[PDB]
Every structure is written in C-alpha cells, then in structure tokens.
Fold this protein.
Amino acid sequence: ALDKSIVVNLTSRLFADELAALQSKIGSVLPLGDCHRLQNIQALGLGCVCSRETSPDYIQIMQYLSKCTLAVLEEVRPDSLRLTRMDPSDNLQIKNVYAPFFQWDSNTQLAVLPPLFSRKDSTIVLESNGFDIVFPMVVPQQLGHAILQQLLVYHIYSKISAGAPGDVNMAELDLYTTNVSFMGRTYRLDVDNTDLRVLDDLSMYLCILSALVPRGCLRLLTALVRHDRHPLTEVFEGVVPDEVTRIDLDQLSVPDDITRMRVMFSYLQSLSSIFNLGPRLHVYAYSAETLAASCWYSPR
Amino acid sequence: ALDKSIVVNLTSRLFADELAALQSKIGSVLPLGDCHRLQNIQALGLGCVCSRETSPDYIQIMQYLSKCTLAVLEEVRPDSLRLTRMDPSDNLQIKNVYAPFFQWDSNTQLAVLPPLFSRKDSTIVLESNGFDIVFPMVVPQQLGHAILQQLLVYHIYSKISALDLYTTNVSFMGRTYRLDVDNTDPRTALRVLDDLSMYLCILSALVPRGCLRLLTALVRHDRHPLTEVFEGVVPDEVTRIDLDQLSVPDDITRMRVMFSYLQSLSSIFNLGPRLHVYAYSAETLAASCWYSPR
Amino acid sequence: THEIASLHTALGYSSVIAPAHVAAITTDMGVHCQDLFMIFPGDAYQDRQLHDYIKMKAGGYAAGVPRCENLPGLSHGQLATCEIIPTPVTSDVAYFQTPSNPRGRAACVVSCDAYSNESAERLLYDHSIPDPAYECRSTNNPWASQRGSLGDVLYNITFRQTALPGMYSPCRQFFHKEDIMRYNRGLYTLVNEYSARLAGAPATSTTDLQYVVVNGTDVFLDQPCHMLQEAYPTLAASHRVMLDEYMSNKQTHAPVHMGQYLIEEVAPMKRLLKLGNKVVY
Amino acid sequence: FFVHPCRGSYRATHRTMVGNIPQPLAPREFQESRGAQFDAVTNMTH
Amino acid sequence: MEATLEQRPFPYLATEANLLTQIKESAADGLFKSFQLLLGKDAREGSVRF
Amino acid sequence: ATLEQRPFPYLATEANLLTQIKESAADGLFKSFQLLLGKDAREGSVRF
Amino acid sequence: EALLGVYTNVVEFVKFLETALAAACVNTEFKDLRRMIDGKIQFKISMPTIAHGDGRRPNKQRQYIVMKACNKHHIGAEIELAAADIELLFAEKETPLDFTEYAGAIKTITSALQFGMDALERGLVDTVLAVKLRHAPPVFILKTLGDPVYSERGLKKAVKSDMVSMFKAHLIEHSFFLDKAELMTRGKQYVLTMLSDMLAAVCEDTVFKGVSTYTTASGQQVAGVLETTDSVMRRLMNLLGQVESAMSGPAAYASYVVRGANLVTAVSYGRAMRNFEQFMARIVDHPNALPSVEGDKAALADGHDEIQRTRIAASLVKIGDKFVAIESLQRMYNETQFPCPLNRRIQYTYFFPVGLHLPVPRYSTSVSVRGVESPAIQSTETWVVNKNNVPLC
Amino acid sequence: QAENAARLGRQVLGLLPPPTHRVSLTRGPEFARGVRDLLSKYAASTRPTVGSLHEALRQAPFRQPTYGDFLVYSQTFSPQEPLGTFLFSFKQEDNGSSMDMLLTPTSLFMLSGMEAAKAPQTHKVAGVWYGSGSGLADFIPNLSELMDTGEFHTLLTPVGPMVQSVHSTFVTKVTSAMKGVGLARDEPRAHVGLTLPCDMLVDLDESCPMREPAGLNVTIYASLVYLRVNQRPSMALTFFQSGKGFAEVVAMIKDHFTDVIRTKYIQLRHELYINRLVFGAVCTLGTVPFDSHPVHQSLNSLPVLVFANFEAACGPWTVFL
C-alpha cells in the first residue's frame, strides 16, 4: 500500500560525458541522508562527510553509514536522478558495478564498507554542480573483514619503515598483504603507495589498546579475588604471557590508573562496534552473465 | 492491520498530588510485564526489580530491561492509566520529558537506560495504591555507553578499597554529572567484570609486535593530540616485549584473532533496545522513530 | 502447479519400445587408454625423483559442462577410454571371438535362484565348479576372475565422486560384485526395473572424454550390457597383413594363422567397413 | 603369494625377473621366441 | 498411508478381455506387487463384518 | 474403536455436559479424550 | 530510412486431446485430486482348470487378487511479471498516450498468461509420454516372454538359461531393423514381419477392451499408437499408405464429481467410491446376479460412452487387420528447445585382446600370405578400425 | 477450456501486491476512503455475525517469505527427511555452474566426529542415513585443517527450514525458506514449521520458579564449538532457545560449555598456537513467538520437536569465548 520513491532534482543540466558513467552503474547502492522523496544533491553520496579538502576518514564514515538510509538507482534521466528506497527486510535487486571488481556468489552476506581505494575507482565527479558523489565499497562480509585486516597491517609497517629502514622488508611486506585469497581466488589490490590516510585512525587506536591492554588486565585480575570467583578465570592465568604478570603497579598512581582504565574501555566499545555493525544485506540469487543479484536489506 | 493499546485498570482513585506529576510526563517510555490490554499496576513500574528496601543493582536492572516490552503513555485518567505499545518494527511518536535534559536533533541515535542520576527525581511513589512506579531514562548512545563505561570502572575500584571524583563522575562536552551509588549490590555487576577478565588477558597474549613498535616510535617525540594519555613517557612493559624481530606473516594470523575478539566485546557492552530517530522536532519536543529490539 | 495422477489398468505389459534407426555414432571407437594417474591421485612411489620420471613418460568443470583442457579440439568425436586387464599369454583366442565377460568367468546371475546371494556368489568366484560357459577350464585368466585378483582389486571400487568431475570406467561394471547381485531376483522384477531406473554410473554424452554422469538430469540412455552381462568383440588383428585378408575375401579368410589371428566383430550394430574403396559388410 | 603361520594370513613376495612367472603362464616356446625378439632389436652377432 | 489390498466382498464387474495368460508364473516371479492367492477352501466371498 | 476429528454433523443435546470436566478429564474419568485449545478448536479438513 | 515490417510469431497451441496419443490413454477430469490419498483398482481372477483322468492329483479351484495404485505427478511453471506492469494497471483517464501505455500492459500480462497455460499443456504430453516410456520394456526381452510355449512348465533353472540365450540372439540379429532394410534384397517385407511381431507381443488384454472409445470412418476399430521421430515417420509412411488419416474421438474429458452420497462417506469416513449409484444398484437394488459382459458393459464405460465424438486429424496405417495411428512429437519438443525422449542413446561395451601367444603345433589356413609365418616373430600390438574407417594400432 | 483459463484470471489478479496509494487531488477527499487496513477497531453488535464482520476479516497484513532454490547431490541430502529440518550452506569454491552443498544437523553430526554419549539418540539415526562418515568428507578434504585454524564457522551461512524436496536418483532439488513462514506445498493453506531433534536443542529458560517477564519474542540461536577429542580436532553444534536478549545469553552459553573449556586449555600450557585460541561462534536463526509449545514427535525412534509460527531471520557468526 505504501509508496516509496526518491527523486532528486538538480540546478544545472548534466554533460554528455557524465551521463554514460551513471548509465554504466544503473543499479547500485547509495547511502542517502534523508528519508523523504524530494531532496538536494549534497547528501546522496559520501561528499557530505568525506571530501578532498577535509582529511580522509575511516571511522567517521563508518559512524555515518549505520546512521544513514540506503537507496538503489533505477533510471538516470537528465537532470532528475531516480533512486528507489530501501526498506527494512525488503526484497529487491542489485547490479554489481564496483571498481575493483570482486566476484559475488549467492548465499553470501553483502556488507557495505567505505571506500579506501583509489579515487577514480570510487567516485564519479559531477562537473555541472561541482559536487562529488561517492559510491561505497560493497564487498562480501568475509572479504570485508579480511580486505580490511591486511591493509591495516600494511599501514602499520609502512609507519615503521618511514621511522627506521632496517626493521621492515618491502618484499616481505608486499607479497603477504597485497595478495588476498578468498573462495579459492586471489585478488591483487591496488596498493596506492605512490606518495592509505583513511586507516590512520584505526592504526592509532589498535596500538593504544595494544600497550594498555596487558597493563590493564593485570590490575583487573588481581582486584577480583573472591570465594565467588568465576571458575573459568582460574584457567586463563595460563594464557597470559609471563612478562605481562611482572608489572610493578607501584609506578602508576591511583589518579593515573583511573584515567587509564577509563581510556581502556572507552576505546574498546568505540572500536568493537565499528568492526561489527553497519548496513549489511543478504543475497539469495545471483547470475554472473547478467551481473544481477537479488538481495534483501537487514538493518542493524 | 494491527492494534497497540494497553489500558491499566486501577483499584483506587488517584490523588490530585500524584495525578499532577503523571500529567507532567505524558510522553514517556516505561516497560511493563505482559502483552495484554488489561493490566494491573504492579507490572507497570520498573520497581519490581528496583525497590527502596532491596539494594538495587543497575546492571541487573539493565539486564531486566532488554527482556521486557516497552510502552508509551497516552493519557492519565484519574482512574485508569492508558498506554500505547512499542513493537518491532514500528514507527512511533516519542517525546522526552526526561529530567536530566539533553538536546536531540533529526537523525540522532537513542537507547534506554535505568535511572542512574537521581532516583527520587525519576521515581514518583504512589501513596494511595502502595506500589511505586520507576521511570527509566532514554539516553543517546554516546552518553549511553559513557555511563556504562564509568559504572564498570566504579565496581573495579570499590573492591580495591576493601576517591569519588574520579570514579563517580561521567564526563561529557560541557557538563559533568554524578552517578547515584549509595546501596548497590555489586554481585551482578561483577560477573560482567569476571567476563572482562576473560577477554582482556587473551587480548594481551596475541598483541601484534609491530603495533607495539609503532608506539615506541611515536610517543617519544612525535606527540599527537590523542596520545596525551601516556604523558610522554613509554610504559616499562612495552620496551620488554619488542625485543623480537618483526615478521609480516606472524602478525597476519594475529590481527585476525585481534579482530574476531573485538566482535565479542559487543556482547558484554550491549545497551538495551535501540531507537533510530529519523525526525525530531525542536520546539515541540516530539520525535519519530522506529523501535528495534536487540 | 498442476496435479496429474496416472494408473495402469492392464495386467501385462501394454507398451513396447524398440531401436529402429541409428542416427550417428557419437563416441569415437578409437584407441585412447585410461590413465590411472588421473583416477587415483593419492598413490605414489617413495622416491620423488623416480615418481616424477614415470609421470614424464605418461603424463575440471566449466559452466556446468566438464571439459579437459589438454586437448584443444577433436576430429573423430567423443574420445573413448580403454582399460587394461593383465592376462596370461596362454589364454585361448577362442574365448575372444564369442561375446562374453572380460574376466575369465561368466557372470550371468539371472539363471540363479531368486534371493540366493550365496548361490549367486558361488557362480562368480568358486573354482570347484567349471564355468557356466565352458566345462573344460575353470577360468580363462586367474588374474581377473580370482577372488582377491588384480581385476577384483582395481575395479571393484564403488564410485566415490570427488568435487573434480571424475572419470568413467568400462571395466568397473563387469567386476563390481554389488551391482551384479542387483540382478539376482526374478525375471519380471528385472523387466519392470529395466526402463524405470538408470543404472549405476554410466558415461556422459557430448563431452570431450567419457565422464561418469554425476548429474543425472534428462540423460536418456539405456544399456543392455548390465542385464545380459556380455561384452561384444571388435576387429582385432595382430598384424597389418591379416586385416587385408579380411577385406579381400570374407568367406575364405583364415581366422588363426601361425603367430597371428583375427577376430571378426559380433555386435548388435553392423557397420560398413570401407578401407580403400573395397567395402566389406 | 603364500600362507604364513602364527591365525595364519596371506603374505607376499615379488617375482623379480620375468622368468619367475611360472611356465604354465609363460611357456618356454614363448620365452625363447621372446629371446629372439631381443636378438633382432639390438642386432647382436652370435 | 500406503494403499493396501482388502478381501471384502465387493460387487466385481465383468471384463470382455481374458486375464489368465501367464498368471501362474507371474505369482512365482513377481510381475506386480500386492497380490494374494486363494486356494479352494478359501476362495469365496468373506462374511461381511463392520 | 478409534477417536477421530473428522468434521461430523454433531447433534445438539438439551442436557449440559460441563459439570466437572476440568478435573475429571485430568484425573482420567474416561479414557480416550483429546483437548483442543484456541485455533485448534475447529472442524479442520476433509481428505479421502 | 524507415521500417518495412515488424513480424512476430503466434504460438501453435496443441492440447493433449487433439493428438493421437490419447488412443493409448483414458482421460477423466477429476475436480479435487488435491484431496485424494490413494487410488485403487481391484482385480479378482478366477482360473479354470482342465479335469483329466490320468495319474494326476487334480487341482482345486484357484483364485487370484491383484491390487493397483495411482502414481502422483506434479508439473511446475513460471511467470515473471514486471514491476511497472502491475503498477500502471490501475490509473487511467489520463492523456490518450496513457491509454495506449495501459492497453500495451494488459497485452503483456495476457501473453504471460498464455505462456503459463502452454507450458502446462506441453507438460501433459510430456508426463504422459514419460509414463509410457517407463513401462515399455524392449522387444528382445518381451518377444521371448510373450510366447507361452517357452514357459508352459514354469521358469525353472534350465528355462531361464534358455531365455538368456534368446535375449542375446534376438539382440544381435534383429536390432536396428529399419537400418537393415536397405541391405536386404527382400526389404519391405522384412520390416513388416518385424513390426507386426512388435504388435503381437503387446498384451492387448485391457479392462476397457469392450469400450468403443476410438473409431475410424465406417466404424472400424483403432488399436494402438506407434510413436516415432520425424526421420522414422518419413520411412514408415512411405512404406505403407496412410489409408484414411482421420479418426473419431471424444471432444472433452470425462467428469467425476464427488457430489451426492459420495460426499457423505467422504466426510464421515476417509473413503469415497467411484460411481456410488451404479455400485449401489448392484448390491441392494438387485442382488444375486452373476456378472455377464453383455449386460455389465455400461458400468465399465462410466462416462466414456456418450461423449461427443469429433473428427480428429491423424495418420492411420494398416498392419495385419489392426489399424494403427502413427505420431511424431518433435514439433512440441523442438520449439521449446528440449531434447525429444524418442531420440535416444544406447551404450555398448567392446571387448578386445592384445599380445597373445599361440600354442606349440602352429598352423595356417590362408592361401595368400608370404611373410610373417616365421616362429621367431612376436606380435606386440593389435589393429582397430575407427568410426571413420581409419585403422589404428 | 477457457473456464480453466478463467480460473487463472481470478487467482492471479486477486493475488498481487497491494498498489501504491496514489489519488489525484482533483478528485477530492476520496483518498481517506481508500484507507481500510489502518482501521483497527471494528463495531460489534448485540449478535454479530460473519455477515457483519466479513469486512473486518478481509484486511490482512502482507506477509511473504523468500525461497531459496538449491540443487544438491543425492548422496549428501538423504532422500528421506522430516520436511522441516534446518539447513546450512557450506561453501568453499565455485567449481561448477550450479551444484550446491547443504548440511542438515544430522549430516553435520557425522562430519564432526563427536562421541556417542554426548548426543546419544541421533547417533543411531545419523548412522543409518549415512555411511561411516567418509561418504561426505570426500567433498571437503580440509576437515582436518579447517578445524585447526578455525575457518569452518565462516563458511556456513544458515538458510532456514525445508519447504519441498523433489528427489531424483543422482540429484535432489531442495527448496528452503528465508525471511519467514514458508508456505507448505502438498498440503494447501498450511505452514511449514521448523523441526529440531530433541537431542541437539538445549533449552535455556528453565526455573522452579524459586519471576521473568513475558514478551512477544523468543529467539533460537545456533552454536558451533571447536574442540579436540582423542587428540583429533572435532566440532560440536548445539542449539539454544531463550528470549533473554543477547547480553545475557553469551554469559548463559559460557556456563553451559564450562567443562569443555576446562579440558581444552589445560593442553595449551605446553604449546600455544594462536590459531587454536578461537573457540566458538553464535548465530541467530530467527524468532519464535511467545508461548508456542514445541510439540514432541517421533520418527524412525527419533524424538523431534516442531516449532509452529517460526520465522527465519539469519545473522552472522560472532566469536564468543
């Protein structure tokens, strides 16, 4: 009974060159900041948050996508784009036009991720309005939890080689990170090491955890001694390394240790969810020659 | 389609005293026990688990709050309370009269929490019927976490005492606040802390060595705005672990298990139900939002 | 959805099918042998240098239809596989002109008593009893018909169907004991199941090699070699010379010469043999 | 193959040379005709 | 629930065709499932009970 | 002698049958009964 | 530049009852087959015996009872309607371009609905033919089983062995019989004695043998249908003339409705008759009447007497005294790009030696071979002839 | 014969999605008259009849599942199933066009290799549907190695209950149900409920009481536990049933598998492999409504529960420990 359609108007007409690129992706998934049918251009991409003049971000995009409404292109007419609204648990169709091309299968779980690769792969610049629309990086969930991980390791050792040359080998680093194995297939990703500023915020966070966690878990074990101690915590004393358990906690005072334990957990829940929960959707049918996947959206 | 309305029969006429406070909070979210039209008043309050003579435990209260169905008030007649219901996945008007006031806008995020600031402000007692009614609090998730961050820290440093300005103050941009702890049962709030002892020392076992070497290169000279926690001095532990040489395929198998255990910490830092507001009016204090359990 | 119920009102058989006209021969009747390197990948010699040596002296799916990529194109059609059953040099040639089993013993279980597995196993294996074909010898080759023999070692494997396409074996039908004991029953239960059930692991159709059909949808074939339990001889000639005698004169042809022989084919289809421009039917 | 005592069981060795194949299964008129085939290939002189 | 044979005294109809050819053998080697022979003392209409 | 829920044309009686059914059927006054709650209390379907 | 013509197809609608395949079946329309559990047809075969006065022990009276059951079949189909097609089915009283936008959308949903019916009408002719192909054993098995002279004594161990030798001897000689007609000088009489032997082997003993169902012109009796491909139908129609090429048959199915007293026993009990009323008039209206085929025929042909007879275009043929209709079903299979089941593949196994010895008293029979005969030679290969008559080693 | 095609004119046009509510403004306030299903309180009379409330029963909500069409070898999917089993889709590599691998919970009992007494009932039943267990492990040669590093739970995507199985000799066609209540094929107007064996399912809300709130929701969870038995890796799959919310059940599961955790981590005081640290995972298989009684059944015996009004809502695998 309900009507859903999202029709965006423009101020100026499109060029003849920019029309052929959106005709190439006439099926896609765009995030879109508003739920109403009539709307201006400045929301339907990722140019509302991520831009060239601003510093590139990962986390503020991932905060934004789970807060945002998704939509699917239907027909590109100058100058009025016609998106279709995505509902909770609604069945619809996706064509997979994304650079670089990852192969989809049916019975896989699509996870919308932000784009962290090159500009010409991700965005299509609209010269008529001077505004950049950005297509997100639709990648299956097991790749998206693995294409993130090796590039986040490659970002760390790129920070070590720039500080000291002798610790990291480039041949050892490239061959083990830029080649990603999934579903029996291999994908050599574009490195873009020509100058990965997207992943600097995560590489700051996981390291600040990695020092405070072994200092943190020593104090949290010794403070919980009871006769009602949970009996699985006696087992995990064999898991912690022996060098961890030799910390003199007389060195850090109480007005320092309250500041650490609050910094300890506040990074954890802000980092746990941004790996976990975004707009993530299922696929139950797929055909490679038509490049069309029947999907349904699970909002979480 | 479907109906949602709960009219609460009540065995005594209310006084003009307690009818005045209920009329003030006409838009409010409170859970209730059973999913029926007719209902006793002894299911409406949150005070079946949070009473005066029993020491409340705010984790177990919050653990209670994700079980129940939630309801919104419509009218306060002098005999019967009348309430509407929240079901998945339904759009509904919501209005905040919640006394530790924060400001919302369109496209904000919300969550439901137990009263953690002033219980006597947030609970009105019914002298005529003898059963008091406890209102929960709705909080945006940034302060929704940050109160649960401080309450877990507080039970850590109350047990070591066997003072308050560092343990009972929740920090936020512009304001500082006080948590309400005088009589708290710590036993349900420590089983959560018992399971944090499980995850956190396993995270200390699989620490990537290149990421610790990144901090030995960073915090000594490269000073950043968000690394002021370490205050310019390296910890004594981090210098001990990076004696080994770095190798790439060791940390690849490590960072995947670093990744997968951070999936688990959502289960211990969960809020209750969530509320995705898509539109919020400013001068009218109403909103529109869709209820999502779990 | 449309629901249709069907019933058969006559007692006896009320419908009869028959082969009439051969359209074309699909499978090339050539010489290509089966390679056990490709059927049994696991087993290997101890020395890697000697096992890589023998592989130098001998040597997957694609859109649902399996293809072998070692051959770029084929000119004579679907390429037939050949087994090799080791045979003593003294086995008589008179076994080979008449249709029979590739093992030395006849294996027709239809003659045996219904629901008697021990009497039916006794026909296949026990050598206190001379053949149901021959009364003179017990077995033509004791390398194949004997109980633990190499025929029964290689080809009594029930097919296991890896994720790889897997390959068809002509000898597997004649040696597999459990697929022969399916025909131990009475006649009219075997006639009722002759057309209704497609039998155990036949070959594919319109492929490069003969693959075992792992996806039985709309493959129509029927094969009389399981029921009647015989295998039909073809043209054999131990020298080039005696194949010229079969096509110069068919009547006064000599079947056995001093060292060499010839087997005239006895098959349900009779092809036109044309070598040169002399035609012998 | 042969029978080995102890239940007994069947245990094996290997006919190394060709001539260890017994004479009902590889007779002597074959085996010296097979030797004349060796003689004609290598083109040896007697 | 499979369909079963029952010997109740139905009012049987008369067919023009004969059925008798190869019946004695087809009991021994089964042409068809679910049959029951009836010899001389027991080839009759059973007593109806309900 | 078997119980069955086929949609018979049940006949109506003058006399009531409701006196002590809750604790007579539960304590087994009579064998071979079946209780039907809610949406199961219906004359279901015919299938021959 | 301009268009010259826009041409489409009209799908050739062929239903089950127009084809001659329905001579091999009996069609009854049955309203609620969704409600049936099982079918049942119940035979009672009373066997007479010869009384002769040798040293025999004389046989008493024998009796057989045979139970048959239905076989359920399901057919699926598919229709995909467009999104905007269903959307603009409703709004109208717009501009005359929106009338012809509308009227071209009802043409889409009706042509999508003809496709749902055609794909179901082809499914009858498919699934009825798949019923026939499962209960059709070949000639070489059924010819030797169709004669009682081989099994008068019973199938002992020596009779079964004597029939297996005859399945083999009939499979080598008489197979591919229409391909052997070219090389035989006799020819057109060999096929006719082959194909009339296929006719005599089929059990003509049907329950409905007295029912009149199909006739020719002048009231002659159609008996059976032989079905070929197109390439075989060109052969058999040239060898024997299509003498009449039009038969009579019913225009519609036979109805069976569970109305009346069938409905009471169907609801109260779990069972239901077929033709309760005629079944009641045998028991209680007129008991103790022995069955007699002259007066019992109206209860067999339930409905199939007096269905409206219509002219059916066919192609008949004379075989012996029995008229046989000839079909070919490739037009219903090649237009849908599914392979025909009468096109069919047969696998053979080819047994073959290499590398033997020949024993000590060596011999010869050939007059003309000058070479190989020395005893020192040993053959290490055998020569095979291909499909394309190229010899290989 | 057009009477048979007139039935398709009724049943197709009667069974369509409800159209978008679009009324031109020149017609007036007629669009208020087109809103019927939002009306929820119907008038009752002194003696109401169906002729009074046929309009109240006409408005029904729009519920529809999404089916999954799977084409399976007939050796993995046993030819006889109780038609409501739960399914999983193992996926390793796209080798051919459409040949898919499906795992019933009795089929994944055989690939596991867990001992007899820990699931004493289905070990008899899953031993007769299958061989020794190597009839399925020939498809996955990596079952010794998928259990070591712990990649097996990342290769299962839970699908939902069966609806229909068309079985042939070599290939079985399997139609499952996602998103909700699957419509039954052979019995018309019926609804396929989800059947679990009584052995695998571990109920989670059970009290003397010695009081917990009622609700509308109770969610079935799947679990899959990496362990080692006889110094060989093996998995263990158990089910859970509780409407307590995800913050409690992860603590409720750890109390169930306490002894299993204790026996394993004794072994890694001596050798610590980082691949061995991952222990288990938890999926959400979809909600059951409140106060539905799981009806016990018996098949050959095999006691099998059944959940009416089951709707399937699949989630990911989250690694608990």
About this structure: The longest strand of chain G covers residues 41-47. Residues 28 and 254 of chain G are 4 Å apart (CA to CA).
